[PDB]
Design a protein around this ligand. Structure first.
Ligand SMILES: Cc1cnc(Cl)c2c1[nH]c1c3ccc(O)cc3ccc12
Length: 330
């Protein structure tokens, strides 16, 4: 008598038709390379799950990136590895170049191709209207590819899109939260970063799919065209849904949760309020108007839907008039 089930409207059964080995990552046997090939140069960052270093492959003198892991849910290791191997060579997907055992941590270190990135806080202040469209199309190539392979990223955000602006090149990175989509499976709602979490996550609906990534992409688009970082600025996961409802309105939120027979956390009773849907022109002003067009707003509107089933798919998104002005290569 609980929630109504949901299925992806595209690529629904891709994994069910595959051999066990494609998606059964627990059974994957890791192929190890030689750690002596790599010399660490510069620490680039630390997450809760890993440390990331710039390095050099001493054999070819080529720059490289080393991610040294250590989870508590150790099955994440084989999941990330199998996903990266499955997706290797896809459009705009970061390439896993090697897997080595780190002598100090005694855990797997993932070795990736290098990308000469510019800081998004810096880059998202320079992007022209043309450049926003161009780079959005490139991200879509990556998302359609992984969705078609039966994989959802689940952590789409500006930090995970590495851009070499000089060569106009883009890579979707950090597949540590990525998962195989199986119809009917319930998933953990504690994925994605706060500002990019889809309404399905925020209302604790577990039977979600590829469409989660399209919400996240919509948040990125809104932040770029409106020059507002982040677009939905929640203090916590609960306030995050309130911020969304202040733009999309509460009546469509209740319509969404009623469709799937979901009950909001009663915590919302005294914080959600009653809000109308805003027209997107509300967010336009003299400083962002050169980035806004009727095409931009229409495309945005079709990504940022409460109902995960109603959002544009990656392939449909690439069909949108927003991308008509973009020169396609080649
Ligand atoms: C924080 C973090 C987590 N996971 C990955 Cl795969 C990466 C990451 N930073 C990077 C990178 C940073 C710079 C780069 O040129 C390439 C990268 C390639 C992959 C990852």
């Amino acid at each position: 008598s609980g929630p109504v089930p949901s299925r992806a409207r595209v690529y629904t059964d891709v994994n069910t038709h595959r051999p066990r080995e494609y998606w059964d990552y627990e059974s994957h046997v890791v192929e190890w390379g030689n750690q002596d090939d790599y010399q660490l140069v510069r620490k680039l960052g630390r997450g809760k799950y890993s440390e990331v270093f710039e390095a050099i492959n001493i054999t070819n003198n080529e720059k490289v990136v080393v991610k040294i892991l250590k989870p508590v849910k150790k099955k994440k290791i084989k999941r990330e590895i199998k996903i990266l191997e499955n997706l290797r060579g896809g459009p705009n997907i970061i390439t896993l170049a090697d897997i080595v055992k780190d002598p100090v941590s005694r855990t797997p270190a993932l070795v990736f191709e290098h990308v000469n990135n510019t800081d998004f806080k810096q880059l998202y202040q320079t992007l022209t209207d043309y450049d926003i469209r161009f780079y959005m199309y490139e991200i879509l190539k990556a998302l359609d590819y992984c969705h078609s392979m039966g994989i959802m990223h689940r952590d789409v955000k500006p930090h995970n899109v590495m851009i070499d602006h000089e060569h106009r090149k883009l890579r979707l990175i950090d597949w540590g939260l990525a998962e195989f989509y199986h119809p009917g499976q319930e998933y953990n709602v504690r994925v994605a970063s706060r500002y990019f979490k889809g309404p399905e996550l925020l209302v604790d609906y577990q039977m979600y799919d590829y469409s989660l990534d399209m919400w996240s992409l919509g948040c990125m688009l809104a932040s770029m065209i409106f020059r507002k970082e982040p677009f939905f600025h929640g203090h916590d996961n609960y306030d995050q849904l309130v911020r969304i409802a202040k733009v999309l309105g509460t009546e469509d939120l209740y319509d969404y949760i009623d469709k799937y027979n979901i009950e909001l956390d009663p915590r919302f009773n005294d914080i959600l309020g009653r809000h109308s849907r805003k027209r997107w022109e509300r967010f336009v002003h003299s400083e962002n108007q050169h980035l806004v067009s009727p095409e931009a707003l229409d495309f945005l509107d079709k990504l940022l839907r409460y109902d995960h089933q109603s959002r544009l798919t990656a392939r449909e998104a690439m069909e949108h008039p927003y991308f008509y002005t973009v020169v396609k290569d080649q």
